[PDB]
Design a protein around this ligand. Structure first.
Ligand SMILES: C[S@@+](CC[C@H](N)C(=O)[O-])C[C@H]1O[C@@H](n2cnc3c(N)ncnc32)[C@H](O)[C@@H]1O
Ligand SMILES: C[S@@+](CC[C@H](N)C(=O)[O-])C[C@H]1O[C@@H](n2cnc3c(N)ncnc32)[C@H](O)[C@@H]1O
Lengths: 224, 223
């Protein structure tokens, strides 16, 4: 009889089989973790499709991504863009970014993507310039301790109406513990506290299960 | 900590910081107690998500199938611009009247056109000269008719419209081709219809929280 993760997988595989197609570029990007002996860090296919649909619903022309990894989420985001759009994506590990570059070329979207290699908090201030900012959508999916600062930068680099999605905000439930010693937990808590404390952005957080296990995301709308 | 206890606690935590309920919403959330029914309404995080999706789309015209007590209705109507409209459908007159009171309390009754009756009877009448197409459709009524609610959503909406269907996981029963339940088979047929056409594109997300394990489908009409 199926174990719990097997049940979540079976439902995800079922929905995915009918709703989400992966071509060569996506199916290859989804295996980036195997090249680097890492756990699967990419959004699932249904999650990447959701990011794609959110960008298209927003009619996003400029998208900022913090955390390229192997380019899986990047392909979904770039494929939401119009021909004059741009995805700016940031990755700390050069080898990952180089792998992503190969996937984005295979995907036919290299002309839409501006990749940066380095620490996101070093790169983000360099993006506050005409032709790059303002972004219509920001996807935050890198290290968790810096989420508050990434959110601050998302606000500085975007505009009223912009959508900000922050991945992996559940941390196994540890986010409810004010005394938890992990900096990532405290960063996610600080971020939610920042959202509570201002009225020019409005948000919700959704817990999910599926092939990635139990986690969740935050969706914020900048209102001004 | 038990799994469901954790899911509840995390939802309580996120909602405490991100989702406000005023009198109208807090009252609407208790509608099931008056109705002597289980809590069928979207949770606060889920209602907020519906609200944000509508605003992200800049929806001016929204269609809702399944008013119940008006909890989801308030969230959708509050996403509208001043000249927007929410059209919502409910078969049970007593539920619709309760929702009407909530929508007045919420300050959005003037933006809402409520219909009482069987949804498949009402939906054809909405294809009317002088009515703009819908920008968003929320499908949250009975499960067996979801396929026909979906094709009505396509008929009554424009390219770019967002369609959200609630409660599509059914405890995982949807993976079973032999399941006897008409609602399970309706959700399955709806997903098969999405697979079989190219003028709409979608994803389905499994969620957990205060209401347990379930999920929703989000579709973008492309033409
Ligand atoms: C969860 S993975 C991103 C997965 C990708 N968004 C997807 O869904 O396909 C997180 C990534 O952030 C990168 N990263 C971690 N800390 C970083 C930092 N300070 N600046 C930039 N990238 C960082 C990691 O190297 C890793 O590739
Ligand atoms: C899940 S509840 C809706 C909850 C509401 N959308 C919310 O989140 O606050 C389902 C509703 O659909 C109504 N309903 C069921 N079958 C229907 C039908 N054939 N036509 C119209 N309404 C129907 C039920 O009476 C009930 O109020």
């Amino acid at each position: 009889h199926m174990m719990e993760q097997e049940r979540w997988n079976s439902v995800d595989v079922y929905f995915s089989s009918l709703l989400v197609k992966e071509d060569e570029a996506l199916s290859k990007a989804a295996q980036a973790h195997r090249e680097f002996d890492l756990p699967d860090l990419a959004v699932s296919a249904p999650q990447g499709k959701l990011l794609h649909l959110l960008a298209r619903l927003r009619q996003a022309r400029r998208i900022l991504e913090i955390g390229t990894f192997g380019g899986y989420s990047s392909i979904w985001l770039a494929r939401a863009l119009p021909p004059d759009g741009r995805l700016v994506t940031i990755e700390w590990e050069r080898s990952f970014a180089e792998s992503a570059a190969s996937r984005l070329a295979e995907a036919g979207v290299a002309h839409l993507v501006e990749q940066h290699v380095g620490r996101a908090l070093d790169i983000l201030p360099t993006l506050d310039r005409p032709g790059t900012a303002p972004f219509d959508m920001v996807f935050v999916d890198a290290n968790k301790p810096d989420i508050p600062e990434y959110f601050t930068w998302a606000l500085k680099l975007s505009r009223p109406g912009a959508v900000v999605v922050v991945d992996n905000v559940v941390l196994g439930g540890a986010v409810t513990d004010p005394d938890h010693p992990d900096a990532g937990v405290q960063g996610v808590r600080r971020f939610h506290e920042m959202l509570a404390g201002r009225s020019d952005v409005t948000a919700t957080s959704i817990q999910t299960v599926g092939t990635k296990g139990y986690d969740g995301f935050t969706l914020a709308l900048v209102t001004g």
